[PDB]
Design a protein around this ligand. Structure first.
Ligand SMILES: CC(=O)NCCc1c[nH]c2ccc(F)cc12
Ligand SMILES: CC(=O)NCCc1c[nH]c2ccc(F)cc12
Lengths: 265, 263
């Protein structure tokens, strides 16, 4: 992987592995979600990070994901190479936004794209806060100054409001517990695990006859190792839409909400 | 990745990814187990496998009966690790696949693994322990002289694993596999069982020790609609005896041992 000529975006090529593919011999949405987070880690390392500034570490502040939107047109096949370009942008005092562009390494065609809204949170008290000026000055030198959106569209699905699933849910997957493989290098449940848990309540028939095109996922609270999650789904609709909800089985506290769009094969 | 000059073993270099490391910033044993599986797939593809020879006509597949993994140093996030794999004939009993993990910078052996593969009918699960006429179709891809990753006589890889007696010292119950735990054929992969075995190891042991050896005997496959129980007992460096069984019936699906060292 490497920074582009301007040093304002990062590119990386990944070869799809045997354990990264599903029933139709192509990369899963969780494998794609993993590749997006791996290229973000290398973009931070290349521009001089370990992605918190000296001021952020001093004040015990971290960047957390508030929304993850992923749209796929073609999933890379096992053995195929996929090139991912990522970049961050300042969204004023609200926070930052990280975008991605997935391309076929042979044809150069855009086979997918993603966007995410990141917020600033105190690592210790969990209290969110608007980006201060001194923090913004340290990041701006690594972001393009003119707007560069992966989802520019006049009426895009990345900025759509997600409602709360009303009970009873049409489908459900109960008693979901994270294992050590679901933890990251800091012993926290990986954000990609929530993607898997959301798709657990989608009926197997829908999976076997449809392909996942869009997935918007709003993050509300982190799930601890000793917590048990419930996955709820309802069909809100060749295209099929679903409303999703992840809540603690022990009290119904909401940890996640989302939508998925699927198309016929 | 590529076949060696003789075409009797395959080499591949992997860069350790951010999502592949644990709390100590190094690759997990499941990430290592995945890299071993990935290099075995590419070795099969390079020698002409779309894996399976005329066994396609007879409905026969290769299944893992034993997986033994020894690690001395786990690669760090960002480090490159070179893995060399090869298969060998173990008479009409079956086939044995070995691995050698090395540091790409120093060339030092940081780990090694071995596995016993058997032949099974994919439909009836009968398992034809014996094999004939099909050995010739593979022998041309195996070294003829013995090449063992674990040569030592009376070694940890060929040790008999006993059944954990009840009550177990530690336990992790109600384990269910998700879609990410399935392979390209919708079966629960042999790597998920490694994770489920280590689930019953206390968190305190994990935080103060590093996993050195892991021997795992496969007895029965776990379905998507099956629920597993992970049982552990300290048999002692720290050794443990492991057992994976179906939550209800107590039908054994796996058994093993893990050896851990102080940090
Ligand atoms: C993903 C994330 O932390 N985004 C907000 C911090 C940020 C702003 N501009 C960047 C450029 C490169 C980089 F690695 C991080 C940043
Ligand atoms: C156990 C296992 O790996 N596969 C059984 C088939 C097999 C036997 N000898 C080989 C040599 C290279 C190769 F790619 C496959 C084989």
């Amino acid at each position: 992987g490497s920074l582009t000529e301007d040093g304002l975006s990062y590119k990386e090529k990944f070869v799809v592995r045997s354990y990264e593919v599903g029933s139709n011999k192509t990369a899963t949405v969780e494998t794609i979600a993993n590749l997006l987070q791996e290229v973000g880690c290398n973009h931070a390392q290349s521009v001089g990070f370990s992605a918190t500034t000296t001021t952020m570490r001093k004040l015990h502040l971290i960047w957390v994901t508030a929304r993850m939107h992923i749209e796929i047109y073609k999933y890379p096949a096992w053995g195929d190479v996929v090139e991912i370009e990522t970049w961050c942008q300042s969204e004023g005092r609200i926070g930052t936004r990280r975008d991605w562009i997935l391309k076929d390494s042979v044809t150069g065609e855009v086979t997918g794209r993603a966007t995410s809204k990141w917020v600033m949170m105190n690592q210790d008290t969990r209290r969110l806060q608007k980006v201060s000026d001194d923090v913004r000055d340290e990041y701006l030198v690594f972001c393009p100054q003119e707007p560069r959106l992966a989802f520019p569209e006049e009426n895009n699905r990345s900025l759509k409001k997600i409602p709360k699933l009303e009970d009873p849910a049409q489908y459900s997957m109960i008693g979901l517990k994270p294992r050590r493989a679901d933890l990251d290098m800091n012993q926290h449940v990986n954000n990609v695990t929530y993607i898997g848990w959301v798709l657990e309540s989608i009926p197997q028939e829908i999976v076997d006859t449809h392909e996942l095109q869009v997935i918007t996922l709003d993050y509300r609270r982190e799930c601890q190792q000793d917590d048990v999650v419930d996955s709820l789904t309802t069909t809100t609709s060749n295209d099929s839409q679903f409303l999703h909800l992840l809540r603690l089985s022990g009290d119904g506290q909401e940890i996640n909400r989302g939508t998925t769009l699927w198309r016929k094969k």
